[PDB]
Design a protein around this ligand. Sequence first.
Ligand SMILES: Cc1cc(OCc2c(-c3c(Cl)cncc3Cl)noc2C(C)C)ccc1-c1ccc2c(C(=O)O)cn(C)c2c1
Lengths: 13, 222
Amino acid sequence: KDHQLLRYLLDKD
Amino acid sequence: MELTPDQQTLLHFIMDSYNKQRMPQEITNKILKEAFSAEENFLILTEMATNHVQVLVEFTKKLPGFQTLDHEDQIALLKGSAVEAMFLRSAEIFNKHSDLLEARIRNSGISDEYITPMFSFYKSIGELKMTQEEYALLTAIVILSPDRQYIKDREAVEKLQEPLLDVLQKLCKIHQPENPQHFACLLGRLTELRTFNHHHAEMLMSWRVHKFTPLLCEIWDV
Ligand SMILES: Cc1cc(OCc2c(-c3c(Cl)cncc3Cl)noc2C(C)C)ccc1-c1ccc2c(C(=O)O)cn(C)c2c1
């Protein structure tokens, strides 16, 4: 599990 | 000499997205009201950098074709462009309160080794008198750099970046028809931006003594 926050922001709406 | 409808559409999506960015008033009030000390000053810069990385993700997602790229290459493009985009934006704001911000930067426990080239870049940016379109397109061209580390499909990136360099050049020809070197000076800013990556790495690497934010730790592998 890497860049969890970054992925959350990128993958959110 | 004019942009084609297709180029006008592309430029329009970029400007619209660039124009949405903002620094929350919660943060700006701190620049004005918080204590003045190397420790506090460093913490404020940290909060600003974090808010910017967020603004940067929102801007990138709206860049034409970005979301059609491989999901991991999207991550790699953001991690490799964050410092560069953050310096470009800093430049912009500094060249258009700022007094206190400048003072905090110069007193945040950061070496002149870094501060010096930083303020010199702000100067050369200012001397260019860049338009908002120039700042937005340069920011996107910096983000869509096909040569970053860990990118799996570089050609898919080239396809997105090329059309932006084409529009930026045309804008230079239409708005500065008598100064054929204008485009060239913008590229000089692209190469100058890259030098901040090493500098930034040393600022991070070499002052372990310190916790940043979760967002910054991931983008900069802290
Ligand atoms: C103006 C600044 C500085 C900043 O510093 C963040 C840092 C830098 C460093 C330095 Cl000092 C200068 N340039 C680039 C780097 Cl990257 N070096 O280390 C750090 C932190 C991690 C300690 C981070 C973010 C902003 C910033 C961004 C956008 C806006 C903005 C708007 O968009 O409307 C309004 N304001 C006042 C802004 C401030």
